[PDB]
Amino acid sequence: MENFQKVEKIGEGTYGVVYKARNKLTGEVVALKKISTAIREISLLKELNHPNIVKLLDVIHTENKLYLVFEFLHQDLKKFMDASALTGIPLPLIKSYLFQLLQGLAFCHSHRVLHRDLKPQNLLINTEGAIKLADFGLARAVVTLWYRAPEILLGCKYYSTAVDIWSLGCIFAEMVTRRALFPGDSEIDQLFRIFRTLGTPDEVVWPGVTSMPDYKPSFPKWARQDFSKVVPPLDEDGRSLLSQMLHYDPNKRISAKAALAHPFFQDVTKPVPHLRL
């Protein structure tokens, strides 16, 4: 856009290209995403400001096009995990990232705003130890299924803030194990990977599940596995929190606020990562 010089293509998300760009009236370096209800929704997001949410600087509807101007961060968690693959992210850094993302979510959720599409590529990091949620509230306004809550996969139309806790729990496990927890390549393959690990859900563990739109009585019935086998060598506190974040019933699943009081975070700190830019 006339005021912005494109520097580099950062990504080609579901919603449009994202470029690193430089503003000319200010010299600021930004991320520029090229995309009336959508405009009004998007405008609401300009006010949803928190230190763990990527700042939306400006929303330009010009030439009948939509550009979102975000603060720029230098690395995403996907690339940081790929870079830490041989050693693993240190637990204290895992714990700090998790706590910070929970603070982000607790904030958004308290305003009834859901992310809906959390994934390592949408979690951005800086040199100061911060992690932030990117593309927040845009879903309202190949796609990876790996982080999708089971209520979404079973066709619930009116899903809740719990869907974000599910996604962050999947990311948490991935930080710890250095492998995606549920790497499905179709909706049914995503659902069956979840069932193979957590057991096929039923009315005992999830009241009303059998009435969900895409629920089928013919689903194979797998027994649950042990978290000690899912995320070794995470400690008992981490495994307890993880289990609560991956409850099938969205109403039993831990909230962001309650997760912040979990004993896992008794000793949380804010380390600085080793970042090569």
Swiss-Prot record:
Coiled-coil residues: none
Induction trigger = Induced transiently by TGFB1 at an early phase of TGFB1-mediated apoptosis.
Q: What SMART domains has UniProt attached to this entry?
A: S_TKc
Report the PTM annotation.
Phosphorylated on Thr-14 and Tyr-15 during S and G2 phases before being dephosphorylated by CDC25A.
This enzyme's EC code(s): 2.7.11.22
Chief localization: cytoplasm
Which of the residues bear the PTM Phosphotyrosine?
Y15, Y19
Protein name according to UniProt: Cyclin-dependent kinase 2
Q: Which organism is it from?
A: Homo sapiens
The chain residues annotated with the modification N6-acetyllysine are: K6
